[PDB]
């Protein structure tokens, strides 16, 4: 067991995808892993592993913003084996024409988070994701009849910004979603030599909020969930 | 509701206490509220309202790291009427004379974090408690023959941190406890004019790298939770 | 002697009381010490030993700005076995709330020099005063019939700002007044294990900037130091 | 005309392959177009545009540095039409397990330099390539029997830097090459919304000094042109 | 008057020489200027009127640190006609062949302050005398039969320094002395469209550890005020 | 030879002018010098050397930006023995009372590049010029009859500046003309122990849109040229 982690060696796969709530990662173990079972419930923080058309897969919360999923990550990378890590969660859209229920994949994360400056002799590291992880996702939502948006997260440590004005600056630079993590888990794969991805389906624009309803968002989720999953089996050949 | 707590106006009390684990809030109001309820359960980030000693109570976990943290305390003071945030936690030591079991007060937090920066034009913001709120927590502590030093926390955004040579830093100019939340806490409570706390147990010695048993961080656990509802008992008269 | 005081050990009090003004250490020595002397006049920055109620109490200017008190208090306390400071000064309100002739105590500083990012690594350094000290002066306060307000002050490198936006800034994060020493007489006291406290009057307005008579700033100011020496009783008992 | 190019809109291609040295740029028109004419020789930064199997291309020299490939990329996108850049360039290595004249291609690239910062208001922007781009510079690669690194590229501003000590910090993090441009060029493509992309080939490793034959550096070099040229056909398609 | 000047428009020269010792400014006025009459005498911080060679001149002390010597010197500039300010101090050398008693002219000062950074958007503004006084007091101290030394100056925030390493850095880069308000100064300057010029004599040295003689110091100052005083009649001819 | 100069030791004169533009080096070393040579001509970075009036001198492009000129001085300097750089430039002004065709000497040169904070330890380090090379040229132009200006110029990374806004501040702080190269070339003077200047001609208002078009020049440059050698021969006395 580690800090944040009550299980051993073997109880996860060498692959963890990883929503950030955790009672998504119960909805994912019930939906889509056979044979699935609870590894992990220290802080509520579900963990679950289980197999995906034969392949064994596990499936667990990282808590909200990058110290959390930090510790998460770091922990199943240093003590449980971890090769590859695949968040999956929503982002806010800066671009009008990234369009609500869209999928988008952090190749690179931009954050205002001070942990990759402080990694990196507080020059600029470019937190990017594995290419070949990148890839197998694109080829696996592209299966999915989905093209999947390829580029630039960024990071937010603030769900409450009291800046404003970063949203017309991400617009410019291109980002194609606001979330907390992404920058985060791809210093930490860095930071000690495994692999990860972020893959996002966009849930609003940041600038002018749009309703969805529940179905709406369980079934883009679903489809979220189906890409990774297949990307996976895409990396193991 | 907001869109981290599904509540009504009116299902918090005006103080709430917040260790990082949700299953402590839960633990805390089965143990010392009376009549308590759960009020929240959206992420799994249990919290409860009930009464102690005949006053409202409540209490919900916040999550790890400042991110997360300033997420909760926010939507509780400028959605759910809340006044004080008190959270209750633990910290790593790094002084000599800092001892495991000790209580630790953080009147005011450092931090390695970017958040109160990006809302002081990149100045040094001085992250700071309620002073009423730390005089009503050492004088229930004293009442309760606890006697507990009040000076700085450090509110780190990396658990597992690269900058080693940081801790002798902290040494140097007195830090009493290294957590993750305070200055976030701090900084949103400053921002949106409300009153916060965190006390913290010594559950680790950074220094010589020594560790609380599961005997030792409960016992004191509990004498830190009496000092935080006793001194709100303070603060009404 | 040090290089900036010519006086030798036990020539001071372990307490020292500092304006910015020497000529106001003057006034002090002459109107609230017994047996008042001078024990120092390098730099014209007078210093005076006396008692006050029987405890020896020393008053000594130290000059404007954080690297003026920075010298001074730093020589005091590694030198001259000088226990805790108390700056003794006016300061600049930025919240209308706040009001002309109120008494302020800075449990925290915040800043816009780099002395306390130099020292602390490029992290923020939360600049606090001794809560011992703090809550001395409260109840000091109290006993006098005046009911201060404790919070954080600014301390400014630049008395004509080129960012008058950052008064701003100030006031929506509830800063109680603007000087320019205390965030440095606090990071020399965390540097050298020491204790201080800045008090200081508020004698001016960003806002409502009005001015005052010459009776009410002295009558003033002799509170302030009433306040700021029977902390000190307080503390010895 | 613009400020750097004395050439007209229609004189490049759509897509511009950019060495850092002219006088590559002239050896690649020779080498590898067709009816190759000179388009530029503006501060002998010597360009050209031919035909690569029947495909209108362009290539022409871009200097030493951030500062200077900015130029030329900016003034290209933005008054000669052009839609894609591919810089070709060698790069030290810091892993003793990349290997001299191996292919690197930049998804990402890290950097010492302020000039993104300055556009991303002192946060981190992730300078990233764009990725079919990179993937069809890695098919292309595959093509011809090469088996391409891609990962994070260093972008240095001083050639002769005088903090040793980051190499080490670029060899913790996983950087496959150190360059002088890619991150600047990425920075561009992001402010002017184009696309680009830089591949490299080992030319040394900074630590250690090997050898290599004319040979083998001719074999090389033209196998990134080859790798390049080819990418762009398989873009088109 | 100002707040920190009790004197009237006309009281000061157009040109104001300033120790940071008050007590000097009274020595430089008795000594040196005919008839002089006290203009200033608020906290302590001494200045004079008077004529040298037929020329009105003025003297007061700055105090010590940047923060100080800004005050005292854009109240000159901007409240009492001051067009030149000389300060005139000792600093520490660094380097080897920089000796005690040396007279060394900062063209250039470098700073670890913040308040440049803070006028000039964060970027580096090279702090530098005005040229023509820099080559008048060149000229002066050769009259004199003294070879002065042109280049940088280091002004510290902090006399007592937690970063010894950093004067390594001083000496690596050509440091000539270190002292505490010439950027200060010419950061005033330039704000407000006036011309400064730091001279100091070498008082101690670093390295060595050895220090100039009471009688060496007088002798020294007396040669820094004549070169001084010297230079202004050069710059009006 | 040095990696990017093909010479060797001897085939350059201890002072060397550098334009940016490799075809003005060629057009100096034919107009103004005797016996010239060519020296370099690697990535097409033409050098030479001759003699004005007898004395040898050597002329050879720097390219655009901070680091591309950063390598070349270097290299002369620790290789080449070179004891003197003087760049011969072009800048735009801000301030409108400085005029198109005006000389222009950097005494200092401000930045936006992080080069010098990556020497200084992040502080301010001030770039400046050798000041006997100031004057040597402030001589030269007055017995030329040329009209000279004497102080900052700044140094900047982006030719193409997303941050508008920043030329306001520049004019606020007086400089006189905006290049590309000063600062780097400061800094390294300072690093590797040798002596700098830049001199330019006001070729264009960031003001007024004006400039200078086909016409002016030749003469305004061959002004600076001629200022820049008889600079060297004052020197030499």
Redesign the interface.
Known sequence: AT??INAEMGDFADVVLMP????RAKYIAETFLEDAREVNNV????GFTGTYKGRKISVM?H??????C??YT?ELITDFGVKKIIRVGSCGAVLPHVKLRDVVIG??????????????????????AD??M??NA?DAAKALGIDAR???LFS????????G??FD?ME???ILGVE?EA?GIYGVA??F?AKALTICTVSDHIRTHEQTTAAERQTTFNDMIKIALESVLLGDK
Not at 43 to 46: A, C, D, I, N, T
Not at 114 to 128: M, T
Not at 156 to 163: G, I, K, N, R, V
């Open positions: 800090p944040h950030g709530d955790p009672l802080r509520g923080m579900l919360g808590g909200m913003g990058i110290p959390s930090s510790i770091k190749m690179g994360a931009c954050t205002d988070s001070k942990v990759n400056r402080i990694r990196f002799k507080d020059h600029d590291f470019a937190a990017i290419f070949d990148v890839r694109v390829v580029g630039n937010a440590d603030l769900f409450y910004s009291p800046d004005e970063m600056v410019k630079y291109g907390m920058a860095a930071e030599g």
